[PDB]
Amino acid sequence: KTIIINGVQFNTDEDTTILKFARDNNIDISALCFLNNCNNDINKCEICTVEVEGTGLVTACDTLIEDGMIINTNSDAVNEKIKSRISQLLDIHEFKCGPCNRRENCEFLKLVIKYKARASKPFLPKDKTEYVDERSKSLTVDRTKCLLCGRCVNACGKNTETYAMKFLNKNGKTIIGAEDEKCFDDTNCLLCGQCIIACPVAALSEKSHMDRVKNALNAPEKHVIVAMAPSVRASIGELFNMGFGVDVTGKIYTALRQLGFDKIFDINFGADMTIMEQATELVQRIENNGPFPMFTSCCPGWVRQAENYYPELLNNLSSAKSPQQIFGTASKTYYPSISGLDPKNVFTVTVMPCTSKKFEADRPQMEKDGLRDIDAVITTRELAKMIKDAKIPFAKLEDSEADPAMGEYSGAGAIFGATGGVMEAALRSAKDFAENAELEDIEYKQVRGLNGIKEAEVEINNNKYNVAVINGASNLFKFMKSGMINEKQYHFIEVMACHGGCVNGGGQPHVNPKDLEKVDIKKVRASVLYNQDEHLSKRKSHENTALVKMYQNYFGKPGEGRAHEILHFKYKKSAWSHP
Ligand code: 402
Ligand code: SF4
Ligand code: SF4
Ligand code: SF4
Ligand code: SF4
Ligand code: FES
Ligand SMILES: [Mg+2]
């Protein structure tokens, strides 16, 4: 093929779109609705408009290159068309970037600036109440910002295959939302927030908990605990122009103290707790044979997927609470026993890469004696904004350490945020528990990686067992619908709703398509976690000295006694009722 782009001749045999061929040859072409190798097929934004000689204006994002094509990407006719489309989008967009939560990284704003587009009539709604949906515990919608680009809809389909995010006809007008415009929580939605990640603007956001936190911080009698998820220390640095894959663990501990938090702990400690219970439970299920398989229960997105699509598997879920919930349980019980604080005055806050974590924390039964396990959950984005609002020079901060009591963690807990992380961490303890030894080789590389469905055969106590790691909610459906579950007897299965693991969560920092092309965001973030595991002395959850002291002095033996009573949570399919 011979391609002419802006007077430059190209000789290629590649079969691809004009947009991507231009991107591969450093030729600038704008784009909006195009994401994850798909565009808005029904109402194309036409921001990727280029001029093909002999044909006219075409959309470069979905037009294959052909031999003899003469393309102009920066002609006048092209730029006026693109400027016209952006202007029309501004006519339905509340253009007030000042208080907006996408101010520092909004794809639309940089398109408005690039083409210097102005609205024919400034969209200024008198009352955003009808445009805004804040009924969910995880998601919020602001349709004053929605461009109707369909990226959220496509993302939902690709990532979860639930199609919970739909195009809707709201009284003659086209909008996006849940089925029948219901609250997302009341539908088959997983609350994974992958639709947020795909949104170029502030139309989709997480359900804010920042008022919960700030009100608790300012309350004199409240002792506010904060504990961040594995993925946060590998991600939040992106929002401070520090690049990708930068371990900023120490900076976060310091920033949290300057924010006024009363105690700095870590969810990775709770991750070690989850492994303690789960690995013990796995050994229990082996000696009992059943119920197999055992599924992980730490991902609330997967829990909702099970509840909404596979309720017969609810009993097969691990009884062990998620690292977030199992931490919060101990924060209201164990922590006061070693501090003297009044449990009612304890306020536990977590920092999560996940929007579904907010729903899990607000589950009615996720409490004890009137005390919530987790009082508030803020996303990686929310913490970052909280830091910038306090004008904390994050990139200039010294590394400080967390408080050890519930802040120490092994390398096993560190890799939780990556796909296959929980599986590998659980095997490190389950093997040592069953064989009653301290095994040297603990690296399970075969369950790592970005493959959708990963299986492995493991040898536990002179017996072989089949494990599986499900990477992404869509791959759960594939694993079940295709009958892969029945090819062999699986004993232990990890499931994560977000592909790549929690590092690709819905509460994670946004990454513009032009950095996604150059950076493998899922591997680069996960690398930080794996590097920590490699450099740590303790790489097994049961070697967590702070955790061992907690169990020895308070809980006793894992999987039984008081631990089984308050650190566990079982999901049950609804009792029979009719209708
Ligand atoms: N609870 C919990 Fe988890 C832990 O530890 C986080 O905290 Fe995850 C992360 N990062 C999230 O959100 S949840 C699913 N298990 C894998 S990692
Ligand atoms: S979504 Fe983007 S363009 Fe719209 S107001 Fe917010 S920052 Fe500005
Ligand atoms: S909510 Fe966001 S991703 Fe979905 S159509 Fe609107 S602007 Fe596009
Ligand atoms: S939270 Fe997940 S399941 Fe729900 S609409 Fe968004 S992408 Fe779909
Ligand atoms: S994989 Fe992690 S971030 Fe994604 S829904 Fe599950 S718990 Fe939340
Ligand atoms: S980016 Fe090509 S039509 Fe929208
Ligand atoms: Mg205070």
Residue numbers in the entry: 2 to 580
Sentences from the paper on this structure:
Corresponding to earlier crystal structure data, for all CpI variants a space group of P1 21 1 was observed with two copies in the asymmetric unit cell (chain A and B). The strongest impacts were achieved when replacing E279CpI for A or Q, or C299CpI for A or S, resulting in activities <1%. The conformational differences between E279QCpI and wild-type CpI are insignificant, except that the carboxamide group of Q279CpI is slightly twisted relative to the original carboxyl group. While glutamine occupies the entire space of the native carboxyl group and thus clearly interrupts the putative PT pathway, an exchange to alanine may support additional H2O molecules to bridge the gap. The conservative variant E279D retains 10–30% of H2 release activity but exhibits a significantly stronger down-shift in pH optimum than the largely inactive variant E279Q.
[FeFe]-hydrogenases represent one of natures’ most effective classes of redox enzymes catalyzing the reversible reduction of protons to dihydrogen (H2) at turnover frequencies of up to 9000 s-11–3. With their low catalytic over-potential, [FeFe]-hydrogenases represent excellent models for a regenerative and likewise economically feasible H2 production. Their active center (“H-cluster”) can be structured into a standard [4Fe-4S]-cluster ([4Fe]H) and a diiron site ([2Fe]H). Theoretical studies suggest that the most probable PT pathway comprises of strictly conserved residues E282, S319, E279, and C299 (from surface to H-cluster, numbering corresponds to CpI), including two protein-bound water molecules (Wat826, Wat1120 4XDC19, chain B) located between E279 and C29915,16,20. In this study, site-directed mutagenesis (SDM) is used to investigate the PT pathway of two [FeFe]-hydrogenases, namely CpI and HydA1, which represent the largest (M3) and smallest (M1) type of monomeric [FeFe]-hydrogenases, respectively.
